[PDB]
Amino acid sequence: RQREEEQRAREQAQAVEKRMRLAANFETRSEKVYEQKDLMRR
Amino acid sequence: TPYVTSDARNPHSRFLQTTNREDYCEKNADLRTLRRPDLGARSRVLLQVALNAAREEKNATEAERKQ
């Protein structure tokens, strides 16, 4: 009975780690995107 | 006769070539035909000058604002 709860625990942990990784990648890409827009304007 | 199941116009000729080799050769994969034509020399020089000037002014502004 405890095995199902433990498997759910690893599943939830993996999901939340994936979401945080995606958010960090989005921020890092966005910075360079808007910087090169500014350079094109100049 | 030696011409049974053969042609006397061009005997001793074997056409060792497949369809795919003719159809998907290296000529069809060349990317040089998809590039737009290059600019003139004057425009290239001016492009380099303008890019360098923009880089310098952006770097100067960033240094001035963030010190």
Add this chain to the structure above:
Amino acid sequence: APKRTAELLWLEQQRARQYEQHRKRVEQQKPCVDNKTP
């Protein structure tokens, strides 16, 4: 046609009955999609 025997006649009769049943089920088909009004 080959010579008529007991086993051949039995096989032909059973096989024809099988074919008739299959055809009857093909022509008597009922639907499966639910287009009925709620």
Add this chain to the structure above:
Amino acid sequence: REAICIHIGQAGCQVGNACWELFCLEHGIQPDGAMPSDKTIGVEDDAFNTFFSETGAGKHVPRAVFLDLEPTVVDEVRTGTYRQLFHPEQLISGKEDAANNYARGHYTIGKEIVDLCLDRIRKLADNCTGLQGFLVYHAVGGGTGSGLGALLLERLSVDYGKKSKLGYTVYPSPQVSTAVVEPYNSVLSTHSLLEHTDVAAMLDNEAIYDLTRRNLDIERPTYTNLNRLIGQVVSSLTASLRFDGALNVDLTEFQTNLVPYPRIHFVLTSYAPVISAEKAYHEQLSVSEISNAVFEPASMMTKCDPRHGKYMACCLMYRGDVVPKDVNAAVATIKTKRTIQFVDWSPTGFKCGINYQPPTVVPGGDLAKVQRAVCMIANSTAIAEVFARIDHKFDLMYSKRAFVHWYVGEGMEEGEFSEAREDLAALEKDYEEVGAESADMD
């Protein structure tokens, strides 16, 4: 973002060569996997990610498997021009063919090869972060394409579950034919494909030959021409995932808009500006002209006439220089036409997509260069005529149990013929009932 392609048998591998030639030339990947960038400043766009993954050294390798039971065509790919592009594990080949027998592919021979294929697909799925479906290319006329395609789709459907499976399938042409046993293999394939596929795209070689004779001026076409047209269609449908646009369309939106009931998933396909280079510069090619073109039966890649049926849903993909106002004016004009009819339960019949990237031109190709194109996928009751003709040919041949001893010898029960034929009969009657006007109100 990513999609995985599965190529089965002879048609699927040969169509794969044209598809990967197109995707390489459209992204700019060289035959050895390298991208010859012109500048180091800036960064390389992510659009390749849908079809390629890069190694740490920057080489690209594609997300595809090629499946065959005979080695010859895959060995030709191994020895051809794109040798360095594909990973050698992805090109899987057996020793001997399924000899036009669905039973030999499904029960006896495909059962040995299927576990290696599933291991390769697993190795691909572990190297993804947003897989959103499988695309499958195969022909249902041959033995290994039908048998191994069905068995493999069954295993993926159990292992991956909800993930979508969209098929491009080459069916037996209505009067051009290549083998005697085509009806048995096509019926038995269609029985498995009915339960385990979300959208099925229908193709007929006779239609693409007619299209290449009438619009292009080619008197003696060969399979490379048809495969290049199919590759263009796949590039148009998948462009919505890869480039910027006004109205994007995710593959789940495709499935949601085109399929009204879970069994009604067979769709017609057409492509508009099929034109030669010499004709293209004498005529304008406005949005309304290509929109008028996609509804004529001369544009279709399947031999069926939609005037004998009713449309249920249409999905229109525009790529290139198009403005939404012109799409709206075109669709309103089509809706005015009297020879185009929709079932009365489907009032909002259209889905639109608009992408900014115009179609690419291939050096040895026969299509002209054009700034815009439209591609249509549509669900229509007219497809019932294709099944009726295959089932009629089956009934004439099955009345004498023609060739049946091969199928019974290779491992299949005789009952499977009757089950599949009864299921296809029920699908034909389903298309009869769904298309019946609701004149009765209780």
Add this chain to the structure above:
Amino acid sequence: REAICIHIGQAGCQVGNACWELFCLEHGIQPDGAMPSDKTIGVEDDAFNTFFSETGAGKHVPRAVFLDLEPTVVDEVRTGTYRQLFHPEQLISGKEDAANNYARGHYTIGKEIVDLCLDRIRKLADNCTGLQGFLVYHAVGGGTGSGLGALLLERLSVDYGKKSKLGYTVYPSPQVSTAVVEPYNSVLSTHSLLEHTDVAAMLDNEAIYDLTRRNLDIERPTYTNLNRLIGQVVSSLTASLRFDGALNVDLTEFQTNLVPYPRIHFVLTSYAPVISAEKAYHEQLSVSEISNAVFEPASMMTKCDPRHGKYMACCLMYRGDVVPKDVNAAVATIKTKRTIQFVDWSPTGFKCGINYQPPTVVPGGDLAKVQRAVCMIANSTAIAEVFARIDHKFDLMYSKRAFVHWYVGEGMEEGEFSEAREDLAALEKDYEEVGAESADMD
């Protein structure tokens, strides 16, 4: 941080040639013992010290002895390319072999050669300031390896006491075989390995042959390939002593983490990125992929399947560009798997090590160049199956005294067969009992 290597018999000397070739090329010592300086200004660096000692003139000489009863292979080393690297006294050779008789090696012939070997091992141990173990390479299938290896380990155990002894042992393969009398020698080798070693890693040539056929593309491998793989494994395990890293692991940590009870010290070994040069440029090799590889049975260097048993402890060594967070994520993913099981009394089943030096590439080698690798040593109850097959073959031959007169003639009592067979039977019962769940609570 010094270690002394002892090579016994034919397999041990031939594996020693590959090991010392690799350690020389990895540190950079030329075959003549000189290290060519690269920078004119700066310290000389000191990493060889684990395996080499330098003279005051700067020549390097290695910390090894080569032991054999037949002269041919050692005379070939004396006449080969590395003649000047070894000190000539270190290469010890007798006059005649032990003729596949453990009794001949232990009682009759090894007693003459053993005292020179003990004098050389003593002279090495006196030239140390930090010693952390003896590494021993031998095969238990042959006469001199079994008999002289046992006698020398007994003498070392009395003279050196607490110092650790780690053995790499070639055990008789489960169906590939080379000599008829292998079971008797392997059984008699048991007690020597049970009470006179701290951890013994067992290897079978049939597994390394399978690994070289499946992963590398070699149709006709020979012993130089297997010996190069063993040398790579030893280099990976000893790298933690020689180069900088995030998490170092001293040789005593292996014994502390891998051995639960003093007799339960037999471990399985596997290596992950065994890959060819043509495949290596088509694939990325991330931490999670190689971590998944070491647990697949296709990767092991011993012919046993761990799915038929339970793991008690695992030690994972990562070398190269790896980050600890990725190692933790990989180990958590392995822990999630349902086909990997640990005994319930071992909750923290893993020990990790991370070193920055990537694996070296050997000019004539067959492995590709890769940026990262992982090596595993693990203790599992599945190992009990190897002993059961050795016991069955011994019982078949011993039931009719098939060859006993040779052993009794060379000096051994018939009682020794029954005693050794009962000790290995008790070891089998120990592995049955340790793996039994504690379902009984009092």
Add this chain to the structure above:
Amino acid sequence: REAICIHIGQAGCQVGNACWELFCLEHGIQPDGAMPSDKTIGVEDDAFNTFFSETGAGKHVPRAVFLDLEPTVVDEVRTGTYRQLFHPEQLISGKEDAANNYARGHYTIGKEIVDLCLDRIRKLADNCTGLQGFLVYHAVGGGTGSGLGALLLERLSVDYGKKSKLGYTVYPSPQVSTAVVEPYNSVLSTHSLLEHTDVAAMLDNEAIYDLTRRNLDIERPTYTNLNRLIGQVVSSLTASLRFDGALNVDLTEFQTNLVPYPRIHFVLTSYAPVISAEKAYHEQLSVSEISNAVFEPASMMTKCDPRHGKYMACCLMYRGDVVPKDVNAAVATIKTKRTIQFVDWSPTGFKCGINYQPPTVVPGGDLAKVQRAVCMIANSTAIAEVFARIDHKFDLMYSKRAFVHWYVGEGMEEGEFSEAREDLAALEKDYEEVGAESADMD
């Protein structure tokens, strides 16, 4: 609580040997009738009583009689390994066989032996306190099984009345055959069996041969394999009476649930996890997979195809680690299928049973060890085809009176053949009538 087993003739006694071997090994009694000296019998409970009675000294003896007309097989039982288990009075043997003549058994020879059998059954029945049926094992193809089985069932049916009598019956396979006169004996047997049996389960040896070829890996099966399968089936069906469970099933509920009309009492049997000891260890096999398996024709132990008929009632026995929610989900999924059809008067078609004791493994056996199994008994109109073909073979032989003079010499009026043949014709018409939709005209 109590049940009495009656074994008749050769097939019934040989199947009985396997049954009592299995029931002995499942409870844990030794071949001499004594409980092991090491068992603690923690339940301290009377589980044996369904099949065994204990002596005051604690010896067990089983509630069975073995009836045969030839001595050899029963003398084999008397001299075999279980010699001490049976009471010598229980093993009853006549002088000479019924020579494949129903007439010889019924009229000439069985009339002498029948009063001893009835006296033995009486001696058993007075020493019971909650008897709930008789189990009968016989073949209808042979002389003593037909004639004495009918005569004994008639006498039992008059004397005991309402008490249930359950038969396990081996009918002559439709093309494998062992004797020429099988149709006559089977028709004459079936005439008596229709009136005087409460449920009859049908088996064909060619089907069990097919099942052992496809699922098990046996190239050369023999009757002992079939008998081990039969013993497993009987143990599965009667385990629900004998051990604790979630949903118990007494033998009297079967007749109420399975039999719609008093003549319609012939049922089909099949068994799911037929797998060999060497392989199939990897597949755990969920409830829904084995439920899907029991409906495939490769799983049945009788050669009939249910796709050519309609089910009237099903009884599904699940044994092992199963949870009721999974049984409910499986049965609802089966009910969803389109190739499975029930007669419209039976909407609630299913009975379920769930028992916790997993199936026992026999040391010499050929089935693997598995955690769960499912067993099926089902009522279907397809059975009508077996009788019609037997009747055709009877008509073919009887048209020329091919053997009748033997039967007439042994005592029968010619009218008795025609009466029985007309009654079986009426049984055919009953199976025609029950399958009639019979819409309500108005």
Add this chain to the structure above:
Amino acid sequence: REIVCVQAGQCGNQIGSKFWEVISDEHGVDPTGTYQGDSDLQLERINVYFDEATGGRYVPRSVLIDLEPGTMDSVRAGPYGQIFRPDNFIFGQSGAGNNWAKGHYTEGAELIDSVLDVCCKEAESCDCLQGFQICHSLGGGTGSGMGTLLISKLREQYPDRIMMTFSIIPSPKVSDTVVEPYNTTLSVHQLVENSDESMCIDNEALYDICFRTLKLTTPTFGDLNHLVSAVVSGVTCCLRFPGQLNSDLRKLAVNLVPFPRLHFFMMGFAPLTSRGSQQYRGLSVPELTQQMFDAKNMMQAADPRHGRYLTASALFRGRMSTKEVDEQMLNVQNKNSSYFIEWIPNNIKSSVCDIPPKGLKMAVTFIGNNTCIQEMFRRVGEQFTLMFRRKAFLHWYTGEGMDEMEFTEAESNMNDLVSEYQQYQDATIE
């Protein structure tokens, strides 16, 4: 995917010699056995017919059998004879005497074990074995009797492979041997049970091909054996070269045989034209298809116009469009619709291979399953019944050991084969 060839009797050894000359030429193998080709396309399937001997050499996977070594000395003396492996020549010391019973029962059982040993040595060397291919005449003595004996033994030992035969049958106009009908009848009885697919050739049809199409003034057996070797090497071409629509012997059998006993086929090869006329007409798909169905170019005496096609197969070699092939096969099926059995919706299979035979722009080999083959068997059965009523030469066969019951069984089986073809000719849907 390797094929093993068997050559039996005088005709078989001579046709085999010409076949192996054609195959060695197509793959650029020197008469010394050295590979001298100029493209990898030639090398990549050389394994199909050749085994590799040390330092470059190739040896042909063939078994040669005869009862007197005269023929073996003739083939060994030929221009390509050296290529054959010496251990592959099996011979006895006395002839078959044109008698089926001697070849099957007396010298057959004496030599057969050495042939089975050689065939097993050759079969077990392949990594994956495809079917066997056998060429022999039915009218001879050792070819018919020992060929059918060996066919029965190989069918017992390798029941899962394919068995394909090329066979020469006696002409209706001139006999080469008086007792031809007995040997033919017994051989057809053996073949219908053992074979998977059998092709039949009449020498009269090759003479009519030579006289009308090639206009040769003085043809010789070398020309007839060249036409046969050309078609034989053509049937396997899709197995050993790339193409747009690959094909295989099993796939041909699956598409050609509707019922298992109906495995007797007609053969044809299209590009035949005299050396004077050939400069005046170019090759094209309409010309090949028109010649393909013209009865002058068919290798049997029976004419298609008296029967109907159940199935047919066409294998094309050369670079060509699929549109012309499919539309030509549709046009021929529509225009001659009365000659095709109506309960099969499409009777013709097409296949395309990229590499044509040397010296031809394009080529096709045609295999046809037509009920007019029944006419050949009836004529042989007539001659058999004429001799048997009078016991014309039976004492030779009975003295060797034959039961007269064997003759009545073979007559009954051949009569049933003719009847089944005739019944399928006049079948209807009803």
